[PDB]
Design a binder for this molecule. Sequence first.
Ligand SMILES: Cc1cc2c(cc1F)OC[C@@H](NS(=O)(=O)c1cc(C(=O)N3CC(C)(C#N)C3)c(C)[nH]1)[C@H]2O
Length: 129
Amino acid sequence: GDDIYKAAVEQLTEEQKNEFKAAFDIFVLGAEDGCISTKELGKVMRMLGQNPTPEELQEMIDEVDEDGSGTVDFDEFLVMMVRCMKDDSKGAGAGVRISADAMMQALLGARAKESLDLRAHLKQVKKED
Ligand SMILES: Cc1cc2c(cc1F)OC[C@@H](NS(=O)(=O)c1cc(C(=O)N3CC(C)(C#N)C3)c(C)[nH]1)[C@H]2O
């Protein structure tokens, strides 16, 4: 049931559909496997205010793993974003729940993410950034 997940390509903004390349690219920047692992996780988690455990990262990855060895494909990420907007809470059983925009703004956060107002999904008191 990956209708909006796989079709997210058209659901993504004008800059998002193009940021999905550099975004995930930074996650595996210099990766010999080409994919993301529990190691790279903590590397990005800090960029989005998050300091989980080395054993917990296996959970947020297991639900998005293809090989089943603490990892995730490049496509499993694209959906993780479009699915996050509606499912801000996918972890279930942790201290908090990571969002999608939080990952994008952390990964690149320079190109453009206001063309469609993706960060507007969290209309609430924020910082000056
Ligand atoms: C490989 C990859 C996958 C994911 C990533 C980034 C990635 F690099 O971020 C979003 C995450 N979905 S989630 O619902 O936010 C989510 C939160 C949690 C959780 O147990 N914790 C919140 C926590 C970080 C704290 N304190 C610990 C889980 C299992 N899922 C998951 O899709």
